[PDB]
Amino acid sequence: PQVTLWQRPLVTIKIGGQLKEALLDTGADNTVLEEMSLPGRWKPKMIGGIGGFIKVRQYDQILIEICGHKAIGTVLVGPTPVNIIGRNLLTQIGMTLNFPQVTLWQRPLVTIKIGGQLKEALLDTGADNTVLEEMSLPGRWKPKMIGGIGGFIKVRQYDQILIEICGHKAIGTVLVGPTPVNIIGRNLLTQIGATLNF
Ligand SMILES: CC(C)(C)NC(=O)[C@@H]1C[C@@H]2CCCC[C@@H]2CN1C[C@@H](O)[C@H](Cc1ccccc1)NC(=O)[C@H](CC(N)=O)NC(=O)c1ccc2ccccc2n1
């Protein structure tokens, strides 16, 4: 199927004999599930996101069915607020991002122009908002806090900002603060007609 991004791209997964919902997340390198019961050996691991880091258990060679499509790969289990299917599994179900077409064997990076400046950013189906590293933008803004996998961060909220995403123009809300990576979230992805296809 093809999936637009006006709503979170949720799918049904089956893993460890159990059914769950998860988010198709082009911005995630790994697949991370809420605490659950899986069989077998695992290894401790630390992973980062917005907000900081979390400890998870790493299971390798796990069979997972994603909306009926089977994949075997690494699944991390720990204190995430949302089940996320990252690029490690997305590639196995032939997921593509279209807006050109983009495969997910590498991070889906694009060039953006905003506030007169060129930057690189990550096309992120798993992000509700667009969050940029600290930068100089003109105009008024409002304080705000947003959450990610490791907790929360304080950002400045700029509304009605013009941004060019790989040559495509959009106007919307941009958040600016201590993110390690520039991320383009669904609020802007819809405006450039981005779809997921698998
Ligand atoms: C999952 C993991 C493998 C660890 N990958 C990542 O976390 C990478 C890390 C990258 C480098 C650091 C900066 C962010 C990018 C993109 N992220 C993926 C990225 O898709 C990440 C996935 C996610 C979704 C929900 C909750 C937690 C995590 N999304 C986000 O961080 C965006 C940020 C935002 N507020 O718009 N968060 C959300 O969209 C969002 C939505 C609902 C929520 C409810 C409760 C708590 C937090 C919630 N966060």
Curated annotation (Swiss-Prot):
UniProt-recorded name of the protein: Protease
Residue span relative to the full protein: 489 to 587 of 1435
Site positions for Cleavage: P1, F99, P100, F198
Its job: Aspartyl protease that mediates proteolytic cleavages of Gag and Gag-Pol polyproteins during or shortly after the release of the virion from the plasma membrane. Cleavages take place as an ordered, step-wise cascade to yield mature proteins. This process is called maturation. Displays maximal activity during the budding process just prior to particle release from the cell. Also cleaves Nef and Vif, probably concomitantly with viral structural proteins on maturation of virus particles. Hydrolyzes host EIF4GI and PABP1 in order to shut off the capped cellular mRNA translation.
Lineage of the species this protein comes from: Viruses, Riboviria, Pararnavirae, Artverviricota, Revtraviricetes
Region Dimerization of protease: start-end pairs: 1-104, 49-154, 88-198
Known partners and oligomeric status: Homodimer, whose active site consists of two apposed aspartic acid residues.
Gene for this chain: gag-pol
Segments forming domain Peptidase A2: 20-188
Residue numbers annotated as active site: D25, D124
